[PDB]
Ligand binder design. Structure first.
Ligand SMILES: Nc1ncnc2c1ncn2[C@@H]1O[C@H](COP(=O)(O)OP(=O)(O)OP(=O)(O)O)[C@@H](O)[C@H]1O
Ligand SMILES: Nc1ncnc2c1ncn2[C@@H]1O[C@H](COP(=O)(O)OP(=O)(O)O)[C@@H](O)[C@H]1O
Ligand SMILES: [Mg+2]
Ligand SMILES: [Mg+2]
Ligand SMILES: [Zn+2]
Lengths: 376, 588
DNA sequence: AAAAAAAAAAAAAAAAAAAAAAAAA
DNA sequence: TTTTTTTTTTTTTTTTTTTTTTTTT
């Protein structure tokens, strides 16, 4: 895929001034809705900027994503699309139904009969994407291996005689279901998922996919899937999404060439925002905000800049990264704290969110309240 | 003629300069040291006589033999006068290396057979050193004559005995045949170079006299050798398994000037301060924690009393805190900075257990020791993150190891005591997740016995501050923007190693007196507080804590290479232990 | 305290790579 | 006498079952 004069093509639409919306809408075109999840996956695809000040502070440039949601919401579809669209992308499942496991080992390969070091799946995706379905059904050793990979960005093997440490700088995109098969907003995120706090603490974006009964959305999704079934019958075999091949060409060029530097970030705004969030979160019995959240916001701002190839993070990039990080952090909170932080930080969470979207959301909330009152 | 080529190699060895003749002096020193081998830089050979290097690259098999013979003759010419009993000249293995970038294993097609090839890889298995015969003697069974000095080819190339002096009357005399070292290794392609959806390829390496055991499985290696096939008495037809004849190995990843540098670094009046601020510069705050970690890095002194009992000199540190503080980052730095160090989680690591295990190979019936983080980290540091989530077996194993420094394992085969002299640096979060004072002393589920093991326990909190939050966020943003008194990682690590190997201090009488009085007062205060609370604080103070304070004083005095720990360092160690007694006492 | 599920032990079977001896001409 | 095919043996790995151990009600 080493072409030339396609740098012109990528730059030609790079200046479109709305390419962000195009790319965010050009992820998994077979999945309706879930726009925020698509945005998060785009940011994960383009990635951040790994930096190790001196040689003693290793900071990962990846953006790990965890999609926790009740079943029947196309999480595995997102993971499979990422598998399809991203080079050096591998897919594995918490169950043993995956070709390659998460943990390293050494053995004679069954077909080649040769003694080889089967590196864990995470290692195979050394510079790519590792998709982990059924993230909440892993083994103890699988959990330990994912923890090691996410924490230290490497794997240490001492199985037979191989005392080695080989690095796995992967971006983990995971899919999981809530405990009991249904996500209950009355409980915080960290407690309605079969995952310990340290594991969840290493994910930069948490997407809480909820299947709530809604006649309009239900009808729209039914039309979508039934039309897909019609169009893929054997006999018959607000922007425009980019073609997938051009999308991956753009991803390659951005991920390989442009390395945005945050010399224009407004430290004042970020510091005040962080202090306010700390005070608010501790004012309530809620999971607090920590430094790693600022780290994740920095990574997402760099990734968003990379999407636009700016080479210099701009105020709007920082604001969008803050929007995404605050959306995730708020949705991880319980029901009451959800509204508390929504109202307290509605300004931040409304960046680049036009009036029509908020008005439609509020009207839908009101009509749903009316429906519930009617049918009780 | 081949004699001309050997003469040219002799000239290159004798007269290559750089003034000084590198190879002549290298031969002198190696033969005097008994090494009887040399490392020939390929580029020097090419520059001096490019034809020789080209020949080597095209026909290594015999040109390397010519070079070895020339090196042997030159070594004789430079070190011929020897005492009786060793005057016999010794053959010389000639390892060769070059700066040429290695060629991917996938490019080792058929054409490159018998050429000199440089490839990268990861060695996943190494066989034991064995005997291969370079010179054999065969004696006839009937006439009992001998055919001594039958030249044997190197590499995996056997030899067929003569048929005619009966027919095939010859047998080998083991007592008269000269052999050398021998080893076979398995080299796998580096996982980075393996294509995305693709199996890793393999190759078989064959070492020689001094190349045996220069690597161990797991090393990332660059091999320069002769692509060769087995030669053993000659649906796949005419396929001869291929292997590499190893000639040069490079394993990828203290001078007196540096010793004097360390000496002057220790002599600085504020050496402690510069070391304290030179461990986690990126991490903001926690000066006391950084001082304690420096003390742990330098460690105390191991003492073996005349009765044989051993007092561990390695400090054990624990850090309980909210999941926000940069403590896993601190552990990562510590493992990256300690001379010998390993990072691991409570439940071991990824396919790398925490504590050692012993299993007997049912086929070979050996005693395979699968080394955990503890035994691998002998003489160094083990950084255990999520130290509160161990497994019962591992909990007991560390219970024994942290105090005795030894892991005792007795399996159906044998009993043994592996030596694990590791300093444990543990990180953990509260039982509930966030430290709440309302349940003070109930935020730790550790049994009292384990908490006795740790020399110091630090408690971190984020319960409230605005100025600190602003400063922290701005500092992190500044670090990501940028991306003096700071001893770089390599220099600091080498200084730590030099101090640990060289200086082992001891307490002075006055220091012992002061520490005695202070410890007595601490014990009295802890007992009184426990009585007042009418409950036992799950953070005891014992004579083990006295040992901990003594060890911290020893580490502080070892930083300065001072043989004796003074009163000031004992006071500083008492302050450091006070910053944990703040959790022993003020917590309740 | 007792049952259910998981893990490890252990024993039997298969591949196979190579060295030596008996039968054939 | 000289080849050849077998014979073994010597390692190693793999698979099934059983037994032993760990977790839950
Ligand atoms: N938003 C959507 N757009 C299009 N198709 C969808 C959407 N949500 C669900 N589907 C379809 O509904 C079916 C269920 O989705 P899918 O099988 O991916 O479930 P899932 O979210 O992975 O569930 P689980 O957690 O049980 O594995 C699929 O056929 C999928 O194509
Ligand atoms: N005082 C600090 N100085 C610099 N960075 C910090 C500080 N505290 C937290 N961080 C950042 O916050 C992140 C969380 O740190 P980490 O050690 O992962 O927490 P934990 O040990 O609880 O997992 C780290 O990436 C680190 O860079
Ligand atoms: Mg699924
Ligand atoms: Mg941690
Ligand atoms: Zn004879």
């Amino acid at each position: 895929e080493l072409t030339d004069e396609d740098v012109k093509m990528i730059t030609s639409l790079s200046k479109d001034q709305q390419i962000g919306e195009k790319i965010f809408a050009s992820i998994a075109p077979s999945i309706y809705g879930h726009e925020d999840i698509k945005r998060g996956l785009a940011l994960a695809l383009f990635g951040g900027e790994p930096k190790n000040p001196g040689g003693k502070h290793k900071v990962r440039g990846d953006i790990n994503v965890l999609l926790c949601g009740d079943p029947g919401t196309a999480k595995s579809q997102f993971l499979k699309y990422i598998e399809k669209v991203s080079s050096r992308a591998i897919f594995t499942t918490g169950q043993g139904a995956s070709a390659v496991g998460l943990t390293a080992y050494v053995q004679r390969h069954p077909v080649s009969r040769e003694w080889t070091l089967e590196a864990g799946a995470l290692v195979l995706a050394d510079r790519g994407v590792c998709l982990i379905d059924e993230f909440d059904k892993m083994n103890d050793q699988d959990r330990t291996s994912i923890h090691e990979a996410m924490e230290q960005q490497s794997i240490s093997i001492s199985k037979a005689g191989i005392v080695t440490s080989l690095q796995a700088r992967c971006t983990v995109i995971a899919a999981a279901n809530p405990i009991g098969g249904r996500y209950d907003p009355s409980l915080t995120f960290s407690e309605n998922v079969d995952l310990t706090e340290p594991i969840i603490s290493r994910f930069d974006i948490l997407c809480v996919v909820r299947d709530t009964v809604d006649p309009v959305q239900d009808e729209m999704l039914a039309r979508f899937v039934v039309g897909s079934h019609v169009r893929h019958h054997p006999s018959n075999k607000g922007v425009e999404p980019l073609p997938q091949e051009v999308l991956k060409k753009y991803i390659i060029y951005a991920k390989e060439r442009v390395h945005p530097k945050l010399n224009q970030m407004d430290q004042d705004k970020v510091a005040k925002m962080y202090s306010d969030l700390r005070k608010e979160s501790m004012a309530t019995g809620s999971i607090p905000i920590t430094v790693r959240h600022i780290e994740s916001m920095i990574r997402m701002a760099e990734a968003h800049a990379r999407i636009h190839l700016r080479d210099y993070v701009i105020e709007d990039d920082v604001n969008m990264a803050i929007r995404v990080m605050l959306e995730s952090f708020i949705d991880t909170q319980k029901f009451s704290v959800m509204r508390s932080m929504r109202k307290t930080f509605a300004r931040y969470l409304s960046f680049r969110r036009d009036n029509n979207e908020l008005l439609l959301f509020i009207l839908k909330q009101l009509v749903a309240e009316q429906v519930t009152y009617q049918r009780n | 003629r081949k004699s001309q080529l050997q003469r040219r190699f002799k000239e290159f060895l004798r007269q290559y300069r750089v003034f000084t003749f590198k190879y002549r002096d290298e031969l002198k020193r190696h033969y005097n040291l008994g090494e009887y081998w040399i490392e020939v830089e390929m580029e020097d050979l090419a520059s001096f006589d490019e034809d020789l290097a080209d020949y080597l690259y095209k026909q290594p098999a015999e040109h390397l033999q010519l070079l070895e013979e020339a090196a042997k003759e030159v070594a004789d010419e430079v070190t011929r006068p020897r005492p009786s009993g060793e005057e016999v000249l010794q053959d010389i293995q000639v390892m060769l290396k070059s700066d040429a970038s290695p060629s991917s294993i996938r490019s080792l097609k058929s054409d490159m057979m018998s050429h000199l090839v440089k490839i990268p890889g990861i060695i996943i298995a190494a066989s034991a050193v064995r005997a291969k015969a370079t010179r054999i003697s065969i004696q006839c069974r009937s006439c009992r004559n001998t055919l001594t000095n039958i030249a044997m080819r190197p590499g995996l190339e056997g030899y067929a005995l003569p048929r005619k002096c009966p027919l095939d009357p010859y047998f080998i005399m083991p007592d008269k045949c000269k052999c050398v070292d021998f080893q076979t290794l398995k080299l796998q392609e580096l996982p980075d170079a393996v294509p995305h959806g693709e199996m890793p390829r393999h190759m078989q390496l064959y070492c020689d006299r001094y190349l045996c055991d220069k690597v161990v499985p797991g090393n990332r290696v660059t091999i320069m050798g002769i692509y060769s096939i087995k030669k053993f008495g000659l649906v796949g037809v005419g396929i001869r398994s291929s292997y590499i004849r190893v000639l040069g190995i490079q394993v990828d990843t203290v001078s007196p000037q540096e010793e004097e540098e360390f000496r002057r670094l220790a002599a600085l009046p504020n050496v402690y301060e510069v070391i304290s601020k030179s461990i986690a510069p990126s991490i903001f705050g926690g000066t006391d924690m950084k001082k304690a970690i420096a003390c742990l890095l330098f460690g105390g002194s191991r003492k073996r009393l005349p009765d044989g009992l051993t007092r561990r000199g390695d400090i054990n540190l624990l850090m309980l805190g909210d999941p926000g503080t940069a403590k896993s980052q601190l552990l990562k730095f510590v493992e990256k900075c300690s001379p010998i160090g390993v990072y691991t989680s409570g439940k071991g690591s990824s396919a790398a257990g925490l504590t050692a295990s012993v299993m007997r190979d049912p086929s070979s019936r050996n005693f395979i020791m699968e080394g955990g983080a503890m035994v691998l980290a002998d003489g160094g540091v083990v950084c255990i993150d999520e130290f509160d989530k161990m497994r019962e077996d591992d909990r007991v194993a560390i219970h024994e190891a942290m105090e005795q420094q030894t892991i005792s394992i007795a399996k159906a085969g044998i009993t043994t005591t592996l030596n694990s002299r590791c300093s444990v640096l543990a990180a953990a979060n509260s039982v509930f997740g966030r430290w709440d004072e309302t349940k003070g002393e109930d935020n730790i589920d550790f049994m009292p016995t384990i908490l006795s093991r740790f020399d110091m326990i630090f408690i971190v909190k984020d319960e409230h501050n605005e100025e600190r939050d602003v400063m922290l966020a701005k500092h992190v943003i500044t670090l990501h923007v940028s991306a003096e008194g700071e001893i770089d990682l390599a220099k600091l690590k080498k200084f730590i190693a030099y101090c640990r190997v060289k200086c082992g201090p001891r307490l002075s009488a006055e220091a012992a007196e002061k520490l005695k009085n202070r410890y007595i007062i601490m014990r009295s205060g802890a007992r009184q507080h426990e009585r007042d609370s009418d409950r036992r604080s799950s953070i005891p103070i014992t004579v083990r804590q006295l040992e901990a304070i003594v060890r911290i004083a020893e580490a502080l005095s070892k930083m300065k290479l001072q043989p004796f720990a003074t009163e000031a360092d004992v006071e500083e160690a008492l302050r450091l232990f006070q910053v944990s007694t703040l959790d022993a006492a003020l917590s309740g």
